[PDB]
Design a protein around this ligand. Structure first.
Ligand SMILES: OC[C@H]1C[C@H]2O[C@H]2[C@@H](O[C@H]2O[C@H](CO)[C@@H](O)[C@H](O)[C@H]2O)[C@@H]1O
Length: 349
């Protein structure tokens, strides 16, 4: 078929599976969330918590699906249909190494639901406690062993792909042990080889040698807020892509529709980026495509705390908060606008 509706398997949408309901999970997990103290605001702050009631959730927006559970198979079905509408072929699943049966169950449910719609799943390896290259290797082996034969498990030219958040928290000399073909605990040329995509944060003078010396296969930028980092400043993307191409690296810039996290971080208003009825998203996605990259990542499907989600949101005013909403656009606008941009990206490939 040549209908302009098919999934794109070089488009990665960051997905969060940490939401709970009292009925399914015992608590409205993540809809309830601690409010962060101001890191510049002195001692003795008692910032409190967002209780995750119907009226007061840990987002500046409000989900069309309500306070859902990430373990509810019927929600997962709906999410996969939303991925199909957006044309995003890869679900990049947050992974926190919780080592509990509820995590294991949820990952299996997500893989199962994804496969029904031909969506693929890769893992976004988070900064879990004591993360290091040895336990990362062990965890990569675990994930490939457990899920590598699942039909929804993502591969690119035969290799799994992982995104590594805050990869700068680990020295390049440690990464080399895992990621150089000569490394002490290498994955290269093993059953557990993978494309390892690190987080490019700051300036080229720091990041270029980091990425080379760490032996990452590529890099992504994550932040939905333009200008938050050098890497999330889209006017740098042409030159970042040029460097990537010259050095055999895969650049996967991250684009998002906006940013706002002031329910959970009231002091963080400088990071707000307004959606302007889609114009912000359009501008960022256009910059990614113009940079001539081979793959794009989307921040986010459903990071509701940070207001970067493309998942449908609805107008809501409760006694406790007046939520933001998609304004002049319909709840599914960011899904269908994603599909538009995936088409323009494919036209460019
Ligand atoms: O997925 C990578 C990274 C993106 C963004 O979700 C944050 C971050 O998690 C931190 O912040 C959220 C609040 O927005 C907290 O709920 C998490 O506990 C915290 O780790 C995430 O690592």
């Amino acid at each position: 078929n040549n209908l302009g509706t098919e999934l794109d398997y070089d488009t990665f949408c960051f997905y969060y599976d940490w939401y709970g309901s009292e009925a399914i999970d015992g608590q409205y997990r993540h809809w309830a969330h601690a409010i962060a103290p101001d890191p510049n605001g002195g001692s003795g702050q008692n910032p409190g918590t967002i209780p995750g009631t119907q009226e007061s959730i840990a987002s500046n927006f409000y989900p069309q699906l309500g306070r859902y559970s990430s373990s509810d198979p019927n929600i997962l079905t709906k999410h996969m249909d939303m991925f199909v509408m957006a044309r995003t072929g890869v679900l990049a699943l947050t992974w926190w190494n919780e080592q509990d049966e509820t995590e294991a169950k949820r990952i299996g449910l997500i893989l199962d639901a994804a496969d029904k719609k031909k969506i693929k799943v890769c893992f976004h390896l988070e900064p879990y406690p004591s993360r290091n290259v040895q336990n990362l290797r062990e965890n990569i082996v675990k994930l490939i062993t457990r899920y590598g034969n699942h039909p929804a498990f993502y591969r690119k030219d035969g290799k799994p792909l992982f995104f590594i958040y805050d990869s700068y928290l680990i020295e390049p000399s440690e990464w080399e042990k895992l990621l150089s073909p000569g490394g002490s605990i290498t994955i290269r040329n093993t059953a557990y080889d993978a494309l390892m995509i690190g987080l490019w944060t700051s300036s080229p003078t720091v990041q270029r040698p980091f990425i080379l010396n760490a032996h990452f296969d590529g890099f992504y930028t994550y932040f939905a807020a333009t200008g938050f980092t050098y890497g999330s400043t889209p006017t740098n993307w042409v030159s970042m892509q040029k460097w990537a191409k010259e050095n055999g690296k895969i650049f996967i810039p991250s684009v998002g529709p906006g940013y706002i996290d002031t329910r959970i971080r009231p002091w963080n208003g400088s990071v707000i980026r307004t959606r302007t009825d889609g114009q912000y998203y359009d501008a960022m996605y256009r910059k990614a495509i113009e940079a001539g990259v081979s793959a794009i990542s989307i921040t986010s499907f459903n990071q509701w705390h940070e207001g970067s989600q493309i998942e449908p949101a609805v107008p809501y005013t409760s006694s406790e908060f007046t939520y933001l909403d998609y304004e002049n656009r319909e709840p599914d606008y960011y899904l269908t606008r994603t599909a538009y941009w995936v088409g323009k990206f494919r036209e460019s490939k």
